[model samples]
Target chain A: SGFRKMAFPSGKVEGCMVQVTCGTTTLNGLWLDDVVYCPRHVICTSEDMLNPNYEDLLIRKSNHNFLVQAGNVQLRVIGHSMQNCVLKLKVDTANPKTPKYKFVRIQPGQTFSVLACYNGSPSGVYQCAMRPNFTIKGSFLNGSCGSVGFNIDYDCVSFCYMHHMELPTGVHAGTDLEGNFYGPFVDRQTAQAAGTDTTITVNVLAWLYAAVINGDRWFLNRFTTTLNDFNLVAMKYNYEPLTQDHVDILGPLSAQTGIAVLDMCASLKELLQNGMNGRTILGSALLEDEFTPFDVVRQCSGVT
Target chain B: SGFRKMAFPSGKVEGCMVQVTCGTTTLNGLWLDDVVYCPRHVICTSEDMLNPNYEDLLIRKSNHNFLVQAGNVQLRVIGHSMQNCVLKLKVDTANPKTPKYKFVRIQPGQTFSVLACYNGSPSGVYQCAMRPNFTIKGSFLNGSCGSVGFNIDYDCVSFCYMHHMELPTGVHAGTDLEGNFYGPFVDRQTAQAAGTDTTITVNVLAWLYAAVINGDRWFLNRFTTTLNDFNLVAMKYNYEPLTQDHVDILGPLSAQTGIAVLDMCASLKELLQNGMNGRTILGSALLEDEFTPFDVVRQCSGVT
Candidate 1:
């Protein structure tokens, strides 16, 4: 499999970012066409592209056991399924058989970070930060499954420092050093900055607890890992602000459901200054839609 | 147009209910087919069909200013959008031109009842009880809008008694006398009985505050006037029940978000036994997504 980084960003992205699609490839070692089926098992490294690889479009047709490296660059892996692709991400594992991460049902909007939270919670909240190295394994559950299908939109992004504010409560949320998972972070502003506002986003199961928020169609213009976007959603009956107690609880997960989740991780700050990490197994339970929620009173706070 | 009632009901409905799909029509005056476009304006009277007429399958391609008579049958008009049809039902009015109802964006799952609460809280709560003599007007907003565009499944239904338990709070819950509008009132049991349990449903604007609910897939196996159904929904986070106060407020509209809505109309009971209806205009405001919600204390209570 061959892949090349394009001279300019994909669409009209503001940052000096690297971009790619299906028809992009390099001829011999001379960099002929960095154009865009982007075959399966293609190892894409930062060296494949030019220098100053601040942000790059790491999305493509499909990749299986897809080895991707960015030399410790924090990247947002954004993508959507065309026909139906079940993908799993193996992140910083002890071995390939670590039994972490399962085959996630891929469709429009579901990203790997979204898949990590599969049944557990919101991808925005319990997100798996894509670090330096990660492997994508693709498999078709039943029908025709392939790494590269028709125009499977894959777009990579980054809000750079925006992630620091939305880490999950009580965790020692370091960078992608441990391929750590954090709470919901991005919203309207970050979406545009990450260049994700131009694509469709997935809605992870956990974050779905957020109610049908009021909308402005533009709210859905992004590459998210959340549930259904507001097209013509049922309006709420009581339009009053949530009771403070309720707000305090969900603050770290999602802020007011404006366009997307605009969380500030207020609770994480509280816990960071005055809290302790819970058991790691509890995090596993939630990821399976198993033991749900943040308590055992912190007994339920840790990820994949 | 000539229309005839068939001897047996359509499909495998458990009750002695009526049914129809596409390419079905009665044979001669002798009632040969009674099968199913059923041209426009074909008045279907109670006498045309069998004696029971208890529950009927009244859906079809399309009908414009379609005058349908069932001699005072209280029906639940359940339907889905095939292409894109905009239909408006004039529920008991002073004149044909009386601005009682506007053109509702009816696609799939939108019933005349669901349309009544377009921007209100929840169609499950602010529903229009379809009485006799309601006229359906067909209009094209922009691109090919029609009453009977393709197989527009319009199935009329009834729980018969399931409704009594889920009326809106501030109303005198009478039968279809005034052609009243009630809150949401159906879940698994009633959906099956209404026979609407078998069709696609719509999710109104107001009734959408419901978050991502845990599922069995069977939850969406009914006809509703709500937004998208649960084919594969992101699972919810905190599995704990809603706060009691939250429940108290949304009780009449929708219940626990089980399937469609299993509202018990508890608040309706509260007001029926002890509250007074607010000014009528206030009800109108909420219906437009205008004022938004139950407020002003008692200042924001009535409906369309």
Candidate 2:
């Protein structure tokens, strides 16, 4: 895998902040000279090109596991009856048994994210290989079972550039560190500033939640995990101010209508703050005022 | 013509109070017989307890034009076409032709107020009638066309007493004003007064726009009017709110996401009040003192 450009503060923190955005390496001559000169864009190029013979491209074709470049890069492969395929991401010189990541059992309409590492050495070439005999089988219970693989060529996405760079005088490490998931943080207050609107910059937290149940009396159950991004800032700023127009547009009509849900939430918040949090009318049924205004009332009294 | 309800306080203020209430009438044996022995639930009896003539029972069957006490009122009438359909408001016996007001060219799916003067004569009975063809034809536009009529059997509805007498003195003529056109109004004050904890209202203003157009076109073109109540209300509340939950659900994966528009309006009000509208300090255009706020000044400039 290659390096992906991510947003970060330049380590220099003081001088001109430059971003070292990683670039993609294009495979120029995949087709024969004659195929490249074909008259029609749809016309079949060389037979090898039709069923791409390139060692790297072949491994990347018809599989969700194999992609062209690492970070923010897209690779497309085209093929038929492609469904439920397995892809293995491998560094060019890494051990075959463990090549960074392996996406096993990628079904149709599904994508797998494989994290990769790259050193600025000659061995930074990443390739993806596809597992054979991938096919989707219909489910009998809910009619939801499917294992169809999609052609990788149809999955190419526009590239996104990371916009942060490390200055020459800044800390530079070849490999990734656990706490350095957000890269090196440079203090702007400690260095000579460029009069820019610069302040403390840190990466937004990427948190996910998972629910798993294992080991029942008669059997073992594996459940799918639903991921949710709980923005810590959201709870802190749920209720803001309202203008006269806001009251006019949302007050009367949406009051009882569906759109009045905001009003309902507001009402709930007021009740919680005054009745439960402020005056202790409901007593200890609620966990004191530990929960937020909205959560406490909505959960305890089922107001919202 | 019938006695239509009047606006409160003489309709002289920008905001007025209007109450939509139901009316009551006695359903005699004639009306009850049809409903008691309806085709769907019939009990053969040689000696008819109520009016023996089936046609009389059928004539006023399902006829909610007037309050029925004994029988289920149902009606069958053939209308000519669209324009000639009349809304037969059977109220106010004092003057049938011009009982305060009569909404003519009243197509199906449209509502018009008709006054009933029952307070003057407590014992007097009033029945309003229109050419079956006109009323039936009007209902057909929004339903199945061709010859169509419904039946009503006696005993479907029973009214031992009239509730209009229970109202505050001198309040004659009740109206069924349509609810909001956009979102539902579910505030505590309004919903509690409506005698229901769960109330649904719509955006009343959007419908006001259509009402303006409809009223204007009526006078300008002299054409019959037909508009759906549901459609009118929907148009007003079409501007849906973007909530934090929506952003939370779609934010992580999608680069460009929208927030609750109401929140933006509130923030905009704050910005305007603080004299901090918009400026592109470096590369990003933002409102003064607003942090991480979505730039909505561009989109909401003329959105009133």
Candidate 3:
């Protein structure tokens, strides 16, 4: 219930990059904690769209331009209470025949994560409308999401995809257990020499947490070094990618606050690295802007 | 959510012991994942006790003698739901003139861990009673402990006590961040040479989990190795103590199951070790007997 807060600042870079290593190969790749926004279409405010009253709602401006590029892949609603709602999605839209999707009702602390369709993904006119819930109370200031106002974090991205258009057999909630979770496996040159790429989707970090509780003593010592290794990998593979919001947001911060906005991936990676060094980092590398990369999305509704 | 379970076997030794290292020393010591049960009094069923109808409740026998020797420091209730309840305790009982006594309410996922009194702790008449909501339905078989039946886990023990009986200013719920969470630091002899003992209660393992999530890609690989190192530390400092339940439970299991029951500390230590080795263990070293070393106590009520 009680915690002393800490903060840090990191050096700017072009963008974030990581090495992806699979069984026999690796690649210098983009490390995405958010999502790849639909580059072409998004139509909001259609009649069919569900718009709950905005008067009582508190919305924050995101770091990325929502118009064409996705930023953080999340949304936090303040000072409002939203009750039982449905998000309707219609996949296979281009083909009226054999449409996929039905109306699904969702609650707080539940994620609306959808498997991407080759031709289409999260898109269309949808609404997260609230209905009467005389018994349910939605509180915004507090973190409790029990039957209430929206935390509406919509992510059409921030997922792991593996080789050759392959799909895994099943999915899991989250875990703090051991085993191989994919991603960069070996030294850079060796992984790069081979031509394969894979995503480490398993939540290995969670397992490590449980491991510590169960009584492992080594992690507490080698932790920072491990982060350092990951940083080296990131720096070696770093590259910058731009979106519309970068112009509007990063430019002003550079102009007004006199701070340079670096690549998010690189910045986040560095943020984690410095956090472990146990020194006060002087500058801004705000993590509040993003949801935990592994948390279940809470409060969201949409149709595709 | 989907998860595939995995298991492994380990070699066992005498009792379980670990090395605790601080600023400059490391000593082969007791690695307590559970607790040091109050080696004194526990009076049960004192109707000065609150008793609920046990007809719908399920109770399992514990590994340690509920009489004196402490085991897992945990209890799990089967088939019941309990409602608004009070656990009462009368401290400074000997001095009736100036007694410290009060009644407090508790719910599921909450803990009743008490700080040890110089001469007293969790003791005395207590009860977890269920009052009917007429509207509240208590269900078991699922993990929900919403206001009911009972998950009466009384931890007359299981906590972290630091040096010189020193208590830190404030307490925390739990966390997944980096820092010095006490325990073994370096080689064993140095710590042994110094006459001091310390407990590592910060839970560094949790921070490792979060580190992996924030996008560090190393734990998934070295996880098993970390467990192994802890095992070696454990093996180096092992010892065991027996209790009433051990004679009743472990003796028969060894006689009947034909499986040698190793020292719990040693057995548990190996269990973690082999789990990392990736080999199947032929014998029984079941973990079901205990609650996770760290978890919110659910379905419990008592007074001391």
Candidate 4:
């Protein structure tokens, strides 16, 4: 908890090596063998700390520049000359349609940081940009404000959905990283190969319902994103086509999916409701993996 | 944090005075003039620690003896014998009606402590007793157990009901220890003297309802006990007798009282309910004090 003062003859010099000594004692005797020095200079300011430009630290352009750092899903921005400026950071994936933007206020000489993760893993490449807005007495400086851009190539393995069940060619049945098993392809050929059309249909429905109640964005997003893909495969096997409107619901996607699941289980609604005794059916469906929202949906839709 | 052992050539003995010296320089020279000696032996044992009979340390009786030590509202009982004995302690007030009993289990060497508090001050005398239960493999030890009694005279002032309003001679108007205000008597003379029959009646009814919704057993007990008194006063005023059934309800006394309060406020029930959309009416009634459950009850009962 105590520190000794060491005078550096060359003050404020970068990359200067520090050494400590005692009378008649070498590094080993002085317990200095593993001594390390901490950086004494502030490398990044607050506003630009989210996404720092280490190579060109002094570049202060009016336009915004987007940048991404590798490793953990943390972004930092350091404030250069822009004092009390608002920084809007947006992460644009390769899809380009959906860009997640989050706003942060940064004061002069302060570093702002934000973390973004996809399904608990920092593996996605993100096009991150910091758009700084400078205001003089609350009036916007139009021409002086600009944006910065950087490409974040966070290369990591897609460790999610490992337990997903494999489907026949052109269909995937494996589970996601969230432990939700998607399907046994609802195709007649696969159903016949699996020896029981009823079992495969029930499995596919259960996985879908489980994803609905899980409320995990990664799981729900995957389900929604792959809806067309699954429909294409189903069409090849002469199965019913799955539409976006069928899955879309007001408010949370999970609640909409829950209502759909309930709709399918109408015949046994009374029975299920009685069994649940006012408890949320979504939770019950997830707990009882053998029977779920998906199974009810399959039964109601007459999905073979 | 460290202590030194000094040679007391006189050696260790009960109540023997010991002093320390440092060569020709004594404790005064070393600034140790006020040093104290540590105890050489454990004065108390775990077995006799609770409700100990100071005279005989080893008397282990199967029957329980309850005694009260003067101080705060805490009681301690350590099992001398009957390793798994259960002690049932009860406090019977001198009023000959309401008796509160609580049970506590004491292991062979465990010290059991209990706390009891009076409504406001320790004004009433309580007949306290501790009854011991013995079992041979969980079966009762017939006639082997009895109870011990102790009179706890905890002298203290009654400061609970000072905020209560006082009434005329023969009819006291005052608040209970719980700060509930009770009437200008509903009797003809007192009511006329107070200049309003309706206001006094409303005050009484509001106080009664307030006590009920408060859910404090002490307050409820006071209300019920005072009911006969109030009824007698009301009878003197030529009003109909208020029976226990008039106050009694099927559920928790507070909830029943709440419904009764709502029933009286039916015209304003919608308004009141809307205003108190999610708030507790008990708190609201107490806050307003002007119009309450009494007004509703009177309106419903056609009481003048």
Local distance difference test, each candidate: 0.19, 0.18, 0.20, 0.22
Q: After superposition, how far is residue A222 of candidate 3 from its true place, in Å?
A: 19
Where does the lowest 10-residue lDDT sum fall in candidate 1 chain A? A1-10
Single-chain TM-score of chain A, each candidate: 0.18, 0.17, 0.19, 0.17
Candidate 1: list runs displaced more than 4 Å.
Answer: A1-132, A137-145, A149-264, A268-304, B1-304
Q: Write the residue-wise lDDT of candidate 2 on B1-304 in tens digits.
A: 0011110110011001111111221211111111211110011122421323433433443333333221122222221111111112232122211112111232111221111111111111111111111110011000010111111111111111111111111111111111111112111111111111110111111121122222211111112211233234323433223334433432322222222323323332332234222322111122111111111211111010
Better of 1 and 4 by DockQ: 4
lDDT of 3 by residue, A1-304 (tens): 1111100000000021222221222222211222111111011122212342322221322222221111232222121111112111111112112112222333221222211111111110001111111011111110000111111112112221111111121111110011111221211111112122221111122222222222331323312323344445444433122323433433432343232333322333454445323222111111121111122011000000
lDDT (10s digit) by residue, model 3, range B2-74: 1101100000000111222112222121112232111110222223123433222213222222211112322
* Candidate 3 segments exceeding 4 Å error: A1-304, B1-170, B173-267, B270-304
Residue B260, model 4, lDDT: 47
For candidate 2, write residues A247-287 as lDDT tens digits: 34323323323233233333333333433222211111121
Candidate 2 is scored at a TM of 0.14
**Candidate 2, superposed: residue stretches over 4 Å from native:** A1-304, B1-100, B104-304
lDDT (Cα, tens digit) per residue for candidate 4, span B1-304:
0000100100001011111121121110000112111110011233433344433432332212323121222223232221111122222212121122222222111111111111111100111111111100000011101111111111111111111111232112222222222233221112223332221233334434543433321222211224555555555543334445444421232364544422322312232223323233332222122223423232222221
Real A-B contacts recovered, model 1: 0.00
Q: What TM-score is obtained for chain B in each of the predicted models?
A: 0.18, 0.17, 0.20, 0.17
Using DockQ as the yardstick, the better of models 2 and 3 is 3
- Model 2 reaches an interface RMSD of 35.7
Model 1 C-alpha lDDT per residue in residues B91-175, reported as the tens digit of each score: 2322221111111222222222111101110111112222211111111111110111111111322211111111122111111
